[PDB]
Motif scaffolding. Structure first.
Motif, PDB file in Angstrom:
ATOM      1  N   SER D  18      17.018 -36.429 -29.790  1.00 33.44           N
ATOM      2  CA  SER D  18      15.696 -36.906 -29.420  1.00 33.44           C
ATOM      3  C   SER D  18      15.643 -37.076 -27.912  1.00 33.44           C
ATOM      4  O   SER D  18      16.571 -37.628 -27.318  1.00 33.44           O
ATOM      5  N   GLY D  19      14.572 -36.596 -27.301  1.00 31.44           N
ATOM      6  CA  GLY D  19      14.424 -36.709 -25.863  1.00 31.44           C
ATOM      7  C   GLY D  19      13.435 -35.677 -25.356  1.00 31.44           C
ATOM      8  O   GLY D  19      12.635 -35.142 -26.116  1.00 31.44           O
ATOM      9  N   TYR D  20      13.515 -35.417 -24.055  1.00 28.46           N
ATOM     10  CA  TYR D  20      12.685 -34.412 -23.413  1.00 28.46           C
ATOM     11  C   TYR D  20      13.547 -33.575 -22.486  1.00 28.46           C
ATOM     12  O   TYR D  20      14.566 -34.039 -21.971  1.00 28.46           O
ATOM     13  N   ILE D  21      13.127 -32.332 -22.284  1.00 29.02           N
ATOM     14  CA  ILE D  21      13.759 -31.428 -21.334  1.00 29.02           C
ATOM     15  C   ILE D  21      12.686 -30.477 -20.832  1.00 29.02           C
ATOM     16  O   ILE D  21      11.947 -29.893 -21.627  1.00 29.02           O
ATOM     17  N   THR D  22      12.573 -30.347 -19.518  1.00 30.59           N
ATOM     18  CA  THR D  22      11.594 -29.457 -18.912  1.00 30.59           C
ATOM     19  C   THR D  22      12.311 -28.224 -18.384  1.00 30.59           C
ATOM     20  O   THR D  22      13.254 -28.338 -17.593  1.00 30.59           O
ATOM     21  N   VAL D  23      11.870 -27.051 -18.828  1.00 26.63           N
ATOM     22  CA  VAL D  23      12.511 -25.792 -18.468  1.00 26.63           C
ATOM     23  C   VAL D  23      11.500 -24.899 -17.769  1.00 26.63           C
ATOM     24  O   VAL D  23      10.370 -25.317 -17.500  1.00 26.63           O
ATOM     25  N   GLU D  39      18.239 -26.772 -17.126  1.00 27.36           N
ATOM     26  CA  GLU D  39      19.243 -27.819 -17.252  1.00 27.36           C
ATOM     27  C   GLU D  39      18.738 -29.094 -16.592  1.00 27.36           C
ATOM     28  O   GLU D  39      17.810 -29.076 -15.778  1.00 27.36           O
ATOM     29  N   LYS D  40      19.365 -30.211 -16.947  1.00 23.24           N
ATOM     30  CA  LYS D  40      18.926 -31.527 -16.503  1.00 23.24           C
ATOM     31  C   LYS D  40      20.131 -32.447 -16.421  1.00 23.24           C
ATOM     32  O   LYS D  40      20.814 -32.651 -17.424  1.00 23.24           O
ATOM     33  N   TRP D  41      20.375 -33.016 -15.242  1.00 28.69           N
ATOM     34  CA  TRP D  41      21.557 -33.828 -14.996  1.00 28.69           C
ATOM     35  C   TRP D  41      21.160 -35.256 -14.656  1.00 28.69           C
ATOM     36  O   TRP D  41      20.208 -35.480 -13.905  1.00 28.69           O
ATOM     37  N   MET D  42      21.901 -36.217 -15.206  1.00 22.26           N
ATOM     38  CA  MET D  42      21.637 -37.637 -14.995  1.00 22.26           C
ATOM     39  C   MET D  42      22.951 -38.363 -14.773  1.00 22.26           C
ATOM     40  O   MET D  42      23.831 -38.324 -15.635  1.00 22.26           O
ATOM     41  N   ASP D  48      28.484 -38.047 -15.238  1.00 23.84           N
ATOM     42  CA  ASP D  48      27.316 -37.180 -15.278  1.00 23.84           C
ATOM     43  C   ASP D  48      27.112 -36.653 -16.690  1.00 23.84           C
ATOM     44  O   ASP D  48      28.056 -36.167 -17.315  1.00 23.84           O
ATOM     45  N   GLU D  49      25.886 -36.758 -17.188  1.00 23.51           N
ATOM     46  CA  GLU D  49      25.494 -36.109 -18.428  1.00 23.51           C
ATOM     47  C   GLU D  49      24.518 -34.984 -18.124  1.00 23.51           C
ATOM     48  O   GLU D  49      23.771 -35.039 -17.146  1.00 23.51           O
ATOM     49  N   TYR D  50      24.523 -33.961 -18.972  1.00 20.26           N
ATOM     50  CA  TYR D  50      23.625 -32.833 -18.799  1.00 20.26           C
ATOM     51  C   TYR D  50      22.966 -32.478 -20.121  1.00 20.26           C
ATOM     52  O   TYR D  50      23.542 -32.670 -21.193  1.00 20.26           O
ATOM     53  N   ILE D  51      21.743 -31.965 -20.028  1.00 18.28           N
ATOM     54  CA  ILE D  51      21.036 -31.346 -21.142  1.00 18.28           C
ATOM     55  C   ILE D  51      20.723 -29.916 -20.733  1.00 18.28           C
ATOM     56  O   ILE D  51      20.220 -29.681 -19.630  1.00 18.28           O
ATOM     57  N   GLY D  82      28.590 -34.951 -21.799  1.00 19.09           N
ATOM     58  CA  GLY D  82      28.975 -35.620 -20.590  1.00 19.09           C
ATOM     59  C   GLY D  82      29.942 -34.804 -19.757  1.00 19.09           C
ATOM     60  O   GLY D  82      30.087 -33.588 -19.928  1.00 19.09           O
ATOM     61  N   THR D  83      30.626 -35.490 -18.845  1.00 15.01           N
ATOM     62  CA  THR D  83      31.518 -34.833 -17.905  1.00 15.01           C
ATOM     63  C   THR D  83      32.454 -35.873 -17.307  1.00 15.01           C
ATOM     64  O   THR D  83      32.025 -36.981 -16.981  1.00 15.01           O
ATOM     65  N   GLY D  84      33.728 -35.511 -17.175  1.00 20.51           N
ATOM     66  CA  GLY D  84      34.674 -36.346 -16.461  1.00 20.51           C
ATOM     67  C   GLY D  84      35.523 -37.221 -17.355  1.00 20.51           C
ATOM     68  O   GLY D  84      35.834 -36.846 -18.486  1.00 20.51           O
TER      69      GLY D  84
END
Lengths: 66, 106, 155, 103, 103, 51, 51, 52, 60
Positions: D18-23, D39-42, D48-51, D82-84
Motif C-alpha cells: 500500500s502506498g504511492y509511486i509516481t513514474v 524509482e523513489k528513495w526515502m 535508505d528505502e526504495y520503491i 531497504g539498503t545497508g
C-alpha cells in the motif's frame, strides 16, 4: 507401432478376487449418431427432405441414437 | 446481440428501454429459377406486443430454407395498410440458387 | 492489447466410503434330564451343546482437496485465433522487503467475457495456467528436501 | 487386524503493498500503450528505502486525477526494500541458508 | 435350550466437487452435440494441482452466460488431483497396500 | 446406469427420474486401494460363510 | 416384481400401487458376502430345527 | 517407489484445438459480399457450435 | 421453441408477454393424384383463447 503419441499407451488381483472397471469401456461408451444422407434437392426442385426438416414447435425430446 | 455485433456491449442485466424496435417474423417465397441478385417480396409480421409496424424499417435478416441454409437477405421499408403486418416490394435479395429437374429426362 | 484478470478461484472436493459386516451365533443347551436321570447317547454323549461365534469387519476410506486464489493480474494478448478468441499471457513480480514472488497466467478467453471495465474473471480463462509462488531462501523453507521426500515416498 | 493410514499436505501464500509511486513514460507502443518506469528513495533517520515500478499501461485506465491503480499495470515489477545494515538484519546469512536447504 | 443368531451388513459412499472449469469444443457430432475437453493447472506456493474435464453436452443446456452445469455433461470424466511430493502424502504405499489387500 | 425409458416421462428440462427407468442397473462404486478397504477378504469371508 | 394388473388401476401418471397387482411376487434381497451375513448356516439351522 | 505417473501440463491429449481458418470468399466471382461460411446473424445468441 | 430454432433462447421461466401470436390447428385435404409442388387450401382454427385471427399470418 500401435501406440499413439498424443494419447499414449492406454494398455495382485489374485489376492483381491475382484476386477476393477476401466474408464472408457466400449460396453459403456456412447454411440455417435449416424450421419444423415444429403438431400440432393436437384432431383425434386425443393428443399424439403423428410429426414432433415425441423419442426418449429417441437419440444425436442430424445428420439434417436446419441 | 445486434448491438454487440457493432461494438456496443451493455453490462449484463441492463434494460435497453427501447420503444422504437419490434421483433418480427419475415417470410419470402422464392420463385422458380430464382438467380442470385434478384429481389422478391417479403411479408413482415409482428410476434411480440408491438401496437403498430407502420413506418418501420426492417433490419438485416437472413431467410432460411427448409434445409436450414440461408438463401436470401431481407431489408427495406415496410408498407402497412391490421397495423402489425407489412410488406416490402423488394425486401429480400436472392443470394443462392436451388437446383431444378426441369432440364432432365426426355 | 492489455486485459486485466480478476483472480477468483475456489475449488473443493470431498469423497468418502465405508463398509461393515457382522455376524454372531450363540446356541447353548443344558444336558437333558428325563426320568430323574441324565440322558446318554452312545456311551458317553449327552444331549447338550455350546456354540459361540463372533465375526466383525469395518473398512473406510476418505479424501479431500481444496484451493483458492484471490488477487489481480494484468496480462496481454499474444495471439488472435480464427474465431476471434484471444490467447493471453503475462507475469507479475513483487519484491517486498526480501524475496521475490511472481504471478503467472496464460490461457485463452472470449472477447464476449470481457466486462465493461476491461476485466475478465479467472474462471472464464480456457486452458488456464495460474502460478503464484516465491523464489530464493524464502521458498527453500516451503519444501522438505530429499530426506523427508524419501521417507514420505517409502512410507 | 487393524490397518490405518492418514496423510495430508497444505500450503498458503499472501502479500500486500500500500502506498504511492509516481513514474514517467519511457516508451509509447504502436497501439498507444505507455511503458512506464520510475524509482523513489526515502532516507528517514538512518537507512535508505526504495520503491521501483515498471510496466505497461493503457491510457484508458488513467483516472481523471492522473492516477492509475497498480493492478492495471501490465508486466508489473514492484520492488519495495531497504539498503545497508538495516537490510542486513532481514536475511539469515550463509549459515542458516545451508541448514535450511539441507533440512 | 437357547439358540440365537444376528447378522448385519452396511455400506456408504458419497462425493462432491465445487468450482469452475473452462473447456473448449473439440468435436461436433451429427445431432449437434458438442464433445468438450480441457485442463486447468494451478501452482499455489508449492505443488501443482490440475482439473480435467471431458464429455459431451447439448447446446440446449448452455445457459445465457455461456455456462453449463457439470451434471449436464454426458460421458463425464472429472479429475481433481495434485502432483509431486504433495500427492505422495495422500497414498499409503506398497507396505500398507499389501496389508490392506491381505486383511 | 442403463435401462429403458418412455419419452413421456422426460420432463420439460430434459430430465427423468431414476425410478422411471425400466430394467434399471445402477452402480456407484470406487476403484483401487480405496475399494480394497471396503471388502474383508478371503479370511473373513470363509469365517462368515462357515458361521 | 411380477404379477397381473388391470389397466383401470393405472393412475394418470402411469403408476400403479403394488397392492393392486394380482399374483404378486415381490423380492427385495442382496447378493454375495453381504447376504452371507444374513443367514445362520448349517450349524444354527440344525440346532433350530432340532430344538 | 511411487507406483504412479504424474500428469504433465500441456499434454496434447488435453490441449485445446485451434479452429480451422475459413477460406476467403472471393467476391469477384459473384459480385456480392455474401458468403455462406462468413455471414454473421445479428440476433443469434452465439452458442458454441464448432471446434475451438 | 420456435425462437430457439432461430438462435434466440430465453432463460428458463421467462414469460414472453406475447400478444400478437395465437396457437392454431391447421387442416388440409389432399386431393387424389396430388403431386409435389401443388397448393391446397388449409383451414386455420384457434385452439387457445385468442379473440380473433383476423389479419394474421400462418407460420411454417
Amino acid at each position: 507401432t500401435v501406440v499413439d503419441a498424443v494419447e499414449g499407451d492406454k494398455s495382485v488381483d489374485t489376492l483381491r478376487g475382484r476386477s476393477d472397471p476401466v474408464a472408457g469401456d466400449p460396453a459403456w461408451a456412447p454411440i455417435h449418431p449416424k450421419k444423415k444422407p444429403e438431400h440432393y434437392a436437384a432431383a425434386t426442385g425443393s428443399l424439403f427432405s423428410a429426414e432433415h426438416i425441423t419442426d418449429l414447435y417441437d419440444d425436442s425430446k430424445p428420439r434417436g441414437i446419441g | 446481440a445486434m448491438l454487440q455485433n457493432f461494438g456496443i456491449q451493455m453490462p449484463p442485466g441492463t434494460k435497453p428501454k427501447i420503444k422504437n424496435v419490434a421483433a418480427v417474423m419475415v417470410t419470402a417465397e422464392l420463385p422458380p429459377f430464382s438467380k442470385p441478385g434478384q429481389q422478391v417480396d417479403v411479408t413482415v409480421s409482428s410476434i411480440g406486443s408491438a401496437k403498430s409496424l407502420r413506418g418501420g424499417t426492417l433490419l438485416q435478416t437472413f431467410l432460411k430454407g427448409l434445409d436450414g441454409q440461408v438463401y436470401a437477405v431481407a431489408q427495406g421499408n415496410l408498407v402497412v395498410s391490421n397495423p402489425t403486418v407489412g410488406l416490402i416490394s423488394s425486401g429480400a435479395t436472392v443470394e443462392r440458387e436451388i437446383p431444378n429437374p426441369f432440364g432432365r429426362g426426355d | 492489447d492489455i486485459i486485466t484478470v480478476t483472480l477468483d478461484e475456489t475449488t473443493s472436493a470431498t469423497k468418502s466410503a465405508n463398509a461393515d459386516l457382522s455376524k454372531t451365533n450363540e446356541a447353548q443347551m443344558d444336558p437333558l434330564q428325563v426320568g430323574g436321570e441324565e440322558l446318554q447317547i452312545g456311551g458317553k454323549y449327552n444331549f447338550s451343546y455350546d456354540l459361540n461365534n463372533s465375526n466383525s469387519f469395518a473398512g473406510d476410506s476418505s479424501a479431500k482437496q481444496s484451493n483458492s486464489i484471490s488477487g489481480y493480474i494484468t496480462v496481454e494478448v499474444i495471439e488472435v485465433l480464427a474465431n476471434g478468441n484471444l490467447v493471453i499471457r503475462g507475469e507479475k513480480w513483487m519484491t517486498l522487503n526480501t524475496g521475490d514472488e511472481y504471478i503467472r497466467l496464460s490461457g485463452t478467453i472470449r472477447p464476449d467475457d470481457i466486462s465493461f471495465d476491461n476485466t475478465i474473471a479467472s474462471n472464464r480463462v480456457s486452458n488456464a495456467r495460474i502460478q503464484y509462488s516465491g523464489t530464493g531462501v524464502q521458498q527453500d523453507m516451503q519444501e522438505p528436501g530429499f530426506l523427508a521426500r524419501f521417507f514420505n515416498v517409502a512410507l
